[PDB]
Structure formats: structure tokens, C-alpha cells
Amino acid sequence: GLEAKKEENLADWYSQVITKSEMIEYHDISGCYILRPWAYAIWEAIKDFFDAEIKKLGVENCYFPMFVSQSALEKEKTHVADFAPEVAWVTRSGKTELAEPIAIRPTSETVMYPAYAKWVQSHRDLPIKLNQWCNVVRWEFKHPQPFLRTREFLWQEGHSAFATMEEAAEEVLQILDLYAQVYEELLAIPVVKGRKTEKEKFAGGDYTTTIEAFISASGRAIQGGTSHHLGQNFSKMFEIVFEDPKIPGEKQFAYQNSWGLTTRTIGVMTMVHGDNMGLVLPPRVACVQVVIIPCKEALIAKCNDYRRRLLSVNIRVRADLRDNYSPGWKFNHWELKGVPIRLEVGPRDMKSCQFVAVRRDTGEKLTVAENEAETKLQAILEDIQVTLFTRASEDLKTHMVVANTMEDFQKILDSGKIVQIPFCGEIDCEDWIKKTTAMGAKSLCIPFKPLCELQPGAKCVNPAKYYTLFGRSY
Amino acid sequence: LEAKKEENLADWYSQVITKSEMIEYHDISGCYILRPWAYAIWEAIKDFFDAEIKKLGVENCYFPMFVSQSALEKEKTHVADFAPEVAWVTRSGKTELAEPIAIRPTSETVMYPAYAKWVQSHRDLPIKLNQWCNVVRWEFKHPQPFLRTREFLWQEGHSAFATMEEAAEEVLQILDLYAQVYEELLAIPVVKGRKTEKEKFAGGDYTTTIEAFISASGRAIQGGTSHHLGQNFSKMFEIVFEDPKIPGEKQFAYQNSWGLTTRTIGVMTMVHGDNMGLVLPPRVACVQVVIIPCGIALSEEDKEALIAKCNDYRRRLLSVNIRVRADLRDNYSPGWKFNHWELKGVPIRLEVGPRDMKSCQFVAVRRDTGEKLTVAENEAETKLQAILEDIQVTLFTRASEDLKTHMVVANTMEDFQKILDSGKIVQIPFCGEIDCEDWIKKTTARDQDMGAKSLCIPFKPLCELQPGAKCVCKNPAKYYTLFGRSY
Ligand SMILES: Nc1ncnc2c1ncn2[C@@H]1O[C@H](COP(=O)(O)OP(=O)(O)OP(=O)(O)O)[C@@H](O)[C@H]1O
Ligand SMILES: Nc1ncnc2c1ncn2[C@@H]1O[C@H](COP(=O)(O)OP(=O)(O)OP(=O)(O)O)[C@@H](O)[C@H]1O
Ligand SMILES: Cc1c(Cl)ccc2c1ncn2CC(=O)C[C@H]1NCCC[C@@H]1O
Ligand SMILES: Cc1c(Cl)ccc2c1ncn2CC(=O)C[C@H]1NCCC[C@@H]1O
Ligand SMILES: [Mg+2]
Ligand SMILES: [Mg+2]
Ligand SMILES: [Mg+2]
Ligand SMILES: [Mg+2]
Ligand SMILES: [Zn+2]
Ligand SMILES: [Zn+2]
């Protein structure tokens, strides 16, 4: 039983939700968390979707080394100068000092791009589109939290190289849309697509696109996935060049993108859809969509007749026929785990050709005829998915509003909301917003489709260049 | 490709793995990039093994890569001989860590502390977890792409059971699955066996293994490992439960652990590769058939028609589940493509030219034999699928007969030494003592014209040991033991 309340102390509600759902176990190294099968299976569903989609775009899977040499990492600013403290360094094997220390990838640009330079000697050799599923380490400064901000995490990073800007620019938005599908269609989480401001964008790229999600219970936004156009910053840095097709002896630098998505997805799913009864799984990612619990031989045969029939309609179902646990225990158990539907069968319903289905999201008990099983259970699963998305949508609309001068901006921000405001775009101004609201508010993204069109000649909260989504964030 | 596999094995191997576009070199010694052509093979192995272990009830998870200094040293999980292979993170940025942290060389000390917390009663067993992950071992021995790399990808399975008989049954099920990966996927024959006392995982009860043979070097290699740990680790980490029906007794879990790595791909390369390059077994080839337009005089519409035919073969082949690629690139000649996909080891090259179209035929060329066949266009799905099956059987049959030729029996040290020096591995009567196995290693080095180590005690040796047979020292022999020079 979960005894914390998401409204009371978010930090202790989250800790008990991830542990009692058997998603997370704690490790003795700060910011490192064990992914138990319940959590890992969600990542695997995400991985199945994204991998298939990027494969349609021509991207191929690979695996590059985890260790990055001091020269390659230092080669040029993959990072900016402040990222250096988050890099973990190996300096010895056993008791023997390494001649030069080696770093654990915090990202793989500096591992991959020297090889890209070797593979590209003509425009024939482009595009290169590689993706890897792997683990990366960042010795994070902020307070660690499972799946939101971890010291080690799992991700996919995609790195693609092109002959022209226009090819690259198209992929950036293709990948971002796929990140948006993961959140919206898989995890039933609504997101805002946008571009990072000068201050918040990756210093190694030209522009950074992003999807931002909102976590009501904290009043904070969070970056869900990232898709950069690196332009020619890295190809100039690593000499990824090909020969001009028309002009003797003349070199062109490749255009590059890089994009990544992490297990942070699962934490956002938890923070958005979790309730005071525990985890709530969107059916699309639930490895168990229906759990069957009997409330011997006659009644179980009915339970297994339901479970074979549900498998026959491609529904992921588990029959919890264990005799060593009381039904009440099972109810609590699978509710904490967030199974979308509990299918209860008692002696009463069996004789009636009946059963009761309990949806995890709303709690309604539904009495359905036995014949009705595959058709009605799948209809409930799709309404749970739609219901979870609709509830989080209307929650996002409620907490994302518009203000046009600083005093109005703060009042909404202090009410636990994020707001789109007319913005200079300049770093000095964004710093000032950061400390005036302080607890300080950051820019989240410049939305592709802002709530309002910017008023003719409107000024920042210099003239305004764009409505920018601001808020307190992770 | 310049080098020849029989002349200089190391440079042939370096040339096959790079010109097949499997491997790229890194500036960290013993670390190698897995380009998509190699990684697709890993994915094929992964897809098979993963499905199989799920049938056995094993679940997938992911445990931290970092091992605290205290946890790694807290218990005797490994012999101190392994300490030099552990890589240590000692600082972030320029700030030294208060305590250094180790990179997982294996995950016992990370997992088993959590197993102890999760095991509170008999209800909590069995625990069967598997993780696909990367591991670091600062190898002293000569690193080689995929055979011995300082970072590698693997699967490690760790299971805990209430009873010994459950544990023991799984050890051999996993061993059998490893044997199916090598034999049915990679077409490599293997010898199942048990490791000698010297060669076993010191922390377990017994170690089973599959051993593979690489003829061109006359050297064997450990292809996969499956341990019964008994209760050695459950006692160290207190993975215990009280059976209420057995009041006053602590029930220590019976455990297994098992692992398989990207060494698989290197053995496949070494076993089936030839002087034209890689040879992929159809079962793991990410491209089973490459379609190449030939003979491209032709109007633009005619050329478009010939590409249309190539794409129609590609949809026909996809429709019966053959993995196919149409190399429709206009910037390379057909002859270039022939060589390119041969170096990559594609099982079947399907050539289509304009005369072939008008004739309603195509040409299929098998990578394993080089045989060219003219096939009727209507017969494409059935004939290509039949050839793919015969390639697979051909590759396994060749490597089988090669293993049979190079694995023989000797009952005297002098015969053992002579047979060994001919590039073979040998089953000999062996006492089993560690001192003796050391003796054999340095005598087979001294008296050679690299010492030989024990490979496994075969489950099914070639000959039965005679009553009162004595070892090749003077102690009696306990069992026929497979010996050889090894990677
Ligand atoms: N410590 C972390 N734990 C989990 N996910 C993370 C962590 N740091 C970054 N991410 C995620 O990685 C994705 C791509 O990595 P990237 O380098 O763009 O992150 P970032 O800009 O440093 O993120 P943030 O400001 O949210 O820490 C982001 O969309 C973010 O969701
Ligand atoms: N450096 C390595 N690179 C690739 N695979 C490896 C490496 N070391 C071990 N393996 C493989 O990992 C499997 C399981 O790991 P394990 O620790 O049992 O190996 P091991 O006994 O140390 O190996 P070896 O005798 O080759 O040194 C072995 O069966 C072997 O095939
Ligand atoms: C600590 C640190 C360093 Cl040292 C260097 C770059 C870093 C970083 N933290 C964040 N980035 C930026 C990136 O990772 C760019 C993109 N890499 C590919 C996947 C998507 C990702 O956004
Ligand atoms: C360097 C080093 C250390 Cl420091 C510690 C244990 C080691 C090791 N080298 C080898 N083993 C032995 C193992 O890994 C045992 C089993 N672990 C589960 C998967 C299969 C594997 O056989
Ligand atoms: Mg960061
Ligand atoms: Mg950022
Ligand atoms: Mg070893
Ligand atoms: Mg060994
Ligand atoms: Zn301003
Ligand atoms: Zn002996």
C-alpha cells in the first residue's frame, strides 16, 4: 500500500511509487538506479517503436566504444567549457595507472566523428545515418532522482551526416516528431515542440529543437527529448569533408544532426499519470494490459479460458493463479504496478457467464458478459489510453497560459503554471528573468505553434522576437 | 583483399573485418567500433537468445555499470588474480572522488546485494534476471577484434532457486541454447563440457562450457559459459529464506550465472571466412540476397524497367521473409558490386540483366561455393530459399568435418605432444589435478616444434576411459579431458 500522497510531498510519493511498483531498486552509488523488469519492459516498448520508425528513415544501428580519449574529447568544444565537471575519468586498471586517463562517454560525438571523417571521401559516402542504444555517464550537478536526472542512464543517440543543409534540416524535424509520438501516442503525455533560445541551445549545434512536458504536481516543466542541427560545427572540427562535385580541388564540410532520448521518459510517465494508488500504465506500453485474478478446477479453467482468448486477440494478459496470495493482495499488487485493467472472476460471475473489469485510471467496475470479452476489453484499453492523454492534455492547457509583462508573468508562475511570454531572446535578458523570478524560471522552448500570435510591434517583458515558453524546470 | 588466411592469419583477419565494414579501429587500445554490418549479427544472436530465455521464464533488466569500492571487495566474488583487469573511475572533471568506483567487469557484486533484499520467503524465488550490456575488462592477453576486447557487449544471466535440482536443470538448458547459437545460427560446431578444477570459475560449484575450434590457428576458444554456483554466493550475500515447514533452518538460494559475448562474431569470421572475405551464415546474414542490375545503349525507360524488375524481385523475396537488398546505385559498376558484397559475405548474389528479363530468368551465385545457377523467374521464392538452406547446411557440414579431423584421442604424453604440434586439439586421460595441468602447460610449451591448456571435460568424449587407465603424468585418470592451444 502506498501511504504518501502526490499532492502532499512529491519526493516521497515518487520514491514509494517506483519502489513498490517494482520499477526501481536503489544502488549504493548516488544517482544510479537499478531498472527492474517492470521498468525495463517500458523502455523496451519505447525502443521497439522508435527503432522501427528510424529504420524506415534509413538509420542503421551500431555500437561505438564507451571510452573516449583525452585528445578526441579535447579536440574541440563538443561541449562548452562548463560541461567538463560531469565527465567521469578512468585513470588506472587495478593498481596500475593508465599512461593517459580515458573518459566515459557523456555523449558520443567525439567518439563517432573521427570515424565519420575517415569514411567520407566523396559525396557518394553521404548520408551517414547511425544510431546506438547505449548507456552514458554524466556526474550530474543537481539533485539525483530516479529516471529524471540520473548519473548513468540509458538512451539512444542518433548521429547523421549529409551533403546538403536541406536534407539535414528535414531529418531534425522528422526525429522530433517521432519523439513527440513516443510521448503522445505511447506514453499518453502531451508535449510542446519548440526551439531552444540562444542561452539554452546546445553550444555545439546551430539550433536545438525539443519537446517539453509539464509535471503539474511539481509545477515544473521538463525536457523530454532533443534533436539538434549541428550544421558544420563538428565537421569543421573533425574534418569530415568531401570533394566538391563541380569544382576541382574544393572541399565541402558535411552537414550533421544528432538527437537523443532517454529513460527519463518513464519518470515523466510516472509523474504525469501516477495517482495516490500507485503507478498508472498507458496500455500501449503496458507489458501486462489485463491481469486476471480469481476471487478449484472449475473457476481457474474459466480464468485460463479468458487468458487464452485474450492472447488470441493480441492482448497482453497475465493470469495470477497463485494460490499463496489472497485476492486482496493481488488487487493491491497489480494496482501499484499500474496494470490498466483488473479482470476479477468469482464463483458468482462464472455461473452467470459474467466478469467484472476494473480500469486503473478511473476505478470504474464494469460488469461484462463473458462472450463480450475480447471486444469489450480492447475497447476499454483504448479509452484508458485516450482518457489518460485527455486528462493530461486539459491539465497542460490549464497550466500553460500567456502573459505580456513581467508582473503578470510572476503571478502565474507563482501559481504553479508555465507561461508563454514575448521575449527579446537575448542572454542578458534571460539571465535577468532567471533571478527576478527567483526557484528561477528558465526558458523551456520557443513553441513552433505558440498560443497567440505576437502582437504587432510588441515589446519583450528591446522588442519581442517570439513568444517563448518559460517556467520552472528540472 | 591481399592476405591469405592460411599464410598470415592476423593480417587476413584484420583485412576481412575492416573491408567487410564490420570493424573500425579506435584510439583506445583493445576497443573497436562495431559498424552496422557487425552489429546486425549481434542483433540476430540477441533476438534468438532473448526469445528462448523468455520461454524459460527469464526476465530482462538493467543494473548499474558502476561498482562501489566497498561492494566489489566486500565479498570473495572473484580471485585476486582478476584485480588487475578492473577499470577504476577516480575523478569527475578535475575533482577526485572520495572513493574510487569500478566499471562492471561482471555484475555479481551489483546484483546479488539486491537479490538478498528481494528474497524474504520461498514466494520470492525463483529470481531469473538477464541483462544485455557492455562490460570492461582491462585484458592483459593480446586483444583482438571480437575475440578478446577490453570493452565488449554481452548477456549475463543470473538466477536464484529454492532447490538444487531447479538450478542444475537450468545450467544445462542455457548451455544447450549457447550450443544452438553457435551450431544452428552461426553454423559452428562446438564441444560441450565441464571445466577442470583449474579452469573453472573459482566462486562456483562447477563451470560448463562450449569450446570452438579455429583450424587456421589450430587453437580452441571458449564460446560461452554456464556456472552452477550452488550456495557459495547466497551464503556470502545472505540470500536466505525461512521455510516455516522447516523451523530453525536457513535456506540459502541455489544460483547459476551464465554469459555469451560478441566473441561469437569473431569465431564465425575465423571459421567460415575465406580469401575472398567474409562468409555469412544465411541464418544471421542481415542481407541474405543482394540484387544487382547488370548490363546497363539502353533507353532511360529501358533502364527504369530493369530497375523495376530488380525491385519486383525484392518485394517477392521480402514476401517470403528473405532479407534482401537491391543495390540500385548508379555510381558503381556491377563488377565492383560483385566484389563488394562478396567481401561482405552475402550468401546469394542475384544478377538481373536485360537479356535475363526478356528470357524470364535470373542468375544466382552462392557465396560459399561460387556456383552460378540460371533460375526461372517464376521459381524465385522457392529456389532462393532452398539455396539459402543448403548454404547454411554446407557451412556447418564443412566446419563439422574440420572439427572431427582435428580432434583426436591420445593416451600418452608423447603422442599428445606430437598431435598437438600438428595443429590439433586432443582428448587425453587426465587426473584432474591443478599441479598436473600446470605441468602439461609448460611441458607442451618446452617440448614443442605456446603451451596447451585444458579446454573442457567433454560430456560425450570420443572414447570410454579404460578401467584403471592412468593419467598422462603418476595418478589414475579420472576422465578424458579435451586439451589444446587456446585463444
Ligand atoms: N541526467 C539525466 N538523466 C536522464 N535523462 C537525461 C539526463 N540528462 C539529460 N537527459 C535527457 O537526455 C536528452 C538528450 O540529452 P541532452 O544532452 O540533450 O540533455 P540536456 O540538454 O543536458 O538536458 P537537461 O537540461 O534536461 O539536463 C534530453 O532530452 C533529456 O531528456
Ligand atoms: N575480453 C573478452 N572479449 C570478448 N568475449 C569475452 C572476453 N572475455 C571473455 N569473453 C567471453 O565471455 C564469456 C563469459 O565470460 P567469462 O568471464 O566466463 O569468460 P572467461 O572465462 O574470463 O574467458 P577467457 O577464458 O576467454 O578469458 C566467455 O564464455 C567468453 O566467450
Ligand atoms: C556533459 C556533456 C558533454 Cl561533456 C558534452 C555534450 C553534452 C553534455 N551534456 C549534454 N551535452 C549535449 C549532447 O549530448 C548533444 C546530443 N548528443 C547526442 C544525443 C542528443 C544530445 O542532445
Ligand atoms: C575480471 C573479472 C572479475 Cl573482476 C570478476 C569476475 C570475472 C572476471 N573475469 C571473469 N570473471 C568470471 C565471471 O564473470 C563469472 C560469470 N559472470 C556472469 C556471466 C558469466 C561469467 O562467466
Ligand atoms: Mg546536462
Ligand atoms: Mg538544456
Ligand atoms: Mg578472462
Ligand atoms: Mg576461462
Ligand atoms: Zn527583455
Ligand atoms: Zn595428471
Side-chain angles (χ1 to χ4, degrees), chain A residues 138 140 147-150 153 155 223-226 260 262 264:
Chain A
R138 300 183 183 164
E140 297 286 350
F147 298 114
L148 302 180
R149 176 151 315 274
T150 65
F153 53 92
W155 77 355
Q223 183 177 192
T226 315
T262 77
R264 165 180 292 190

Side-chain angles (χ1 to χ4, degrees), chain B residues 82 85 105-106 108 135-137 139 141 143-144 146-155 178 182 195 199-201 207-211 221-227 258-264 453 486-487:
Chain B
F82 283 152
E85 294 183 33
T106 185
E108 284 80 338
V135 283
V136 170
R137 299 188 180 165
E139 297 283 343
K141 307 182 55 116
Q144 303 186 59
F146 298 111
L147 304 183
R148 164 103 48 207
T149 64
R150 291 209 181 111
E151 180 191 6
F152 52 98
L153 302 177
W154 77 352
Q155 76 63 30
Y178 291 166
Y182 273 75
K195 293 282 190 186
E199 283 305 320
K200 78 173 199 183
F201 180 29
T207 297
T208 64
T209 183
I210 45 161
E211 299 284 320
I221 191 168
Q222 185 182 147
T225 317
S226 178
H227 318 277
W258 27 271
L260 177 93
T261 77
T262 41
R263 168 181 290 185
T264 44
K453 67 184 287 169
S486 183
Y487 284 96

Side-chain angles (χ1 to χ4, degrees), chain B residues 36-295 297-304:
Chain B
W37 203 244
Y39 193 75
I41 300 176
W42 187 236
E43 295 235 63
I45 293 170
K46 197 182 203 156
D47 284 346
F48 171 79
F49 191 77
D50 203 68
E52 287 310 310
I53 62 165
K54 264 155 175 60
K55 298 174 185 176
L56 306 181
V58 182
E59 291 191 312
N60 280 340
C61 72
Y62 183 79
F63 276 75
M65 171 186 50
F66 288 134
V67 192
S68 76
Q69 186 176 43
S70 311
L72 189 58
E73 314 258 17
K74 197 190 109 203
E75 301 296 337
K76 252 302 223 201
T77 37
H78 55 270
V79 286
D81 300 297
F82 283 152
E85 294 183 33
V86 183
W88 292 91
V89 172
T90 57
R91 56 179 175 88
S92 55
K94 311 242 189 181
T95 303
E96 280 206 305
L97 308 183
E99 288 172 305
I101 291 154
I103 299 181
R104 142 184 85 207
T106 185
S107 301
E108 284 80 338
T109 65
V110 166
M111 305 177 80
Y112 293 165
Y115 281 31
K117 302 181 199 128
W118 296 334
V119 174
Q120 285 315 129
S121 82
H122 64 290
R123 312 201 281 291
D124 299 323
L125 297 163
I127 297 178
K128 303 178 175 200
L129 299 173
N130 168 75
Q131 71 183 7
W132 296 96
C133 67
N134 61 320
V135 283
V136 170
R137 299 188 180 165
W138 216 251
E139 297 283 343
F140 189 74
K141 307 182 55 116
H142 182 234
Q144 303 186 59
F146 298 111
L147 304 183
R148 164 103 48 207
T149 64
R150 291 209 181 111
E151 180 191 6
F152 52 98
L153 302 177
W154 77 352
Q155 76 63 30
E156 55 186 311
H158 299 256
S159 59
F161 299 91
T163 73
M164 183 264 177
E165 169 182 307
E166 282 173 286
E169 164 184 69
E170 179 191 75
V171 175
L172 298 171
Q173 284 171 326
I174 298 302
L175 194 68
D176 191 51
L177 288 180
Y178 291 166
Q180 300 179 42
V181 165
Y182 273 75
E183 306 208 321
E184 289 171 8
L185 258 53
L186 306 173
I188 299 164
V190 298
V191 175
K192 293 172 175 195
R194 204 215 78 182
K195 293 282 190 186
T196 64
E197 192 71 16
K198 169 172 182 185
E199 283 305 320
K200 78 173 199 183
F201 180 29
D205 185 13
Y206 56 86
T207 297
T208 64
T209 183
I210 45 161
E211 299 284 320
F213 185 58
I214 296 165
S215 304
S217 65
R219 281 171 78 185
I221 191 168
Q222 185 182 147
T225 317
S226 178
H227 318 277
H228 181 63
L229 313 169
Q231 294 179 324
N232 302 157
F233 280 76
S234 55
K235 290 172 178 172
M236 291 169 15
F237 287 95
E238 316 230 53
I239 310 169
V240 280
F241 63 108
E242 181 233 336
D243 186 3
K245 260 63 199 203
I246 304 179
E249 291 293 341
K250 293 165 71 188
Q251 310 297 334
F252 290 94
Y254 293 87
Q255 283 170 273
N256 311 334
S257 84
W258 27 271
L260 177 93
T261 77
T262 41
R263 168 181 290 185
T264 44
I265 302 154
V267 189
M268 168 207 99
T269 299
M270 287 291 215
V271 166
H272 306 302
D274 57 24
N275 296 315
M276 282 168 41
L278 205 54
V279 169
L280 292 177
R283 185 60 182 81
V284 290
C286 59
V287 177
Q288 295 174 308
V289 183
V290 54
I291 301 166
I292 302 170
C294 306
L298 273 173
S299 74
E300 184 86 26
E301 188 181 35
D302 280 355
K303 170 160 155 59
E304 288 158 10

Side-chain angles (χ1 to χ4, degrees), chain A residues 292 294 296 298-301 303-309 319 321 343 345-346 349-350 354-355 370:
Chain A
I292 301 167
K296 219 156 150 143
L299 177 59
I300 281 148
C303 289
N304 273 323
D305 187 80
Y306 282 145
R307 91 140 176 59
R308 284 177 335 261
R309 214 159 197 120
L321 310 185
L343 189 180
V345 176
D349 294 314
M350 164 169 57
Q354 213 158 266
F355 68 86
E370 183 215 339

Side-chain angles (χ1 to χ4, degrees), chain A residues 83 86 106-107 138 140 145 147-155 179 183 196 200 202 208 210-211 222-228 259-265 474:
Chain A
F83 273 159
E86 331 187 39
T107 187
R138 300 183 183 164
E140 297 286 350
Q145 303 179 56
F147 298 114
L148 302 180
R149 176 151 315 274
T150 65
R151 185 146 303 173
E152 188 200 2
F153 53 92
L154 300 178
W155 77 355
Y179 287 166
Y183 274 79
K196 296 282 187 187
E200 271 301 317
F202 177 31
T208 297
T210 184
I211 50 164
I222 188 172
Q223 183 177 192
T226 315
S227 184
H228 314 277
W259 24 271
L261 177 90
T262 77
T263 40
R264 165 180 292 190
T265 46
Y474 288 94

Side-chain angles (χ1 to χ4, degrees), chain A residues 37-53:
Chain A
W38 204 245
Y40 191 74
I42 301 176
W43 187 237
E44 296 232 65
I46 293 167
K47 192 189 289 198
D48 291 351
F49 171 79
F50 189 73
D51 199 72
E53 288 310 309

